[PDB]
Amino acid sequence: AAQTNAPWGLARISSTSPGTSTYYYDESAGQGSCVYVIDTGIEASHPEFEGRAQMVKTYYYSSRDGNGHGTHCAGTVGSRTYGVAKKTQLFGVKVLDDNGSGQYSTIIAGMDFVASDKNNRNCPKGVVASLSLGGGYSSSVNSAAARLQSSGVMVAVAAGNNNADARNYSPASEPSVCTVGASDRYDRRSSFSNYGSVLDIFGPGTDILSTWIGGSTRSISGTSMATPHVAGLAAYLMTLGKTTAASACRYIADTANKGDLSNIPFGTVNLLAYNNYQA
């Protein structure tokens, strides 16, 4: 399959070179897999999700995404036009309030929730969790991410946007999960992207067009935007039977575009998420 005039990020993950505009992908498109987006919620009614999205848990007064961040991330995972895995099932877990903030205890509860809830869902091809959030180092937050991964869920987390070593941030600094940095359309490390030895992979993160609340779209930037590219790619690859939840991060790193990025500090991987699609 081919999507012409695709968002640059989608094009990039299906090419060995920057500057292309077509997203090439297998028509299976992540069908049979499930992705939990742990964020501000998802506007499930957005036409772009085609009824494949639903809220399963909120830690606040409503399950509604009053912010937009969660909807945007979910869109990059699996919306029709803006998504990597266009036929995946999306589950929303609202651990962040409508200002985009949340307490660590709530974020942890949300992760524990997903580890259990997946046992109630029909996801034959596997389960992924996308965490476009974080803050200062916390061993308890790291532990929760480690538990989720251990339970058999592919966990992808944002490196953070402090232009600093991600070792001082959580859940980014948990080694067992898949920590995702951001790049721009010219194959430079995004100016805000965290770096360091704990990073596993880079994905498109600067000027990413996706779904927004009120049935709209917008372009925003962050490691928050790179994370769902990797989460979507994982779901896509698991559906193809190429990898499992336990080894997806390693498989993505192994099959990545290598050495393409500039402005990568010594000690940080030079690896960009790549689907290796060949018609």
Binding site: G160, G205, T223
Partner: peptide, 5 residues
Amino acid sequence: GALAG
């Protein structure tokens, strides 16, 4: 994360 997007 950190600032995380």
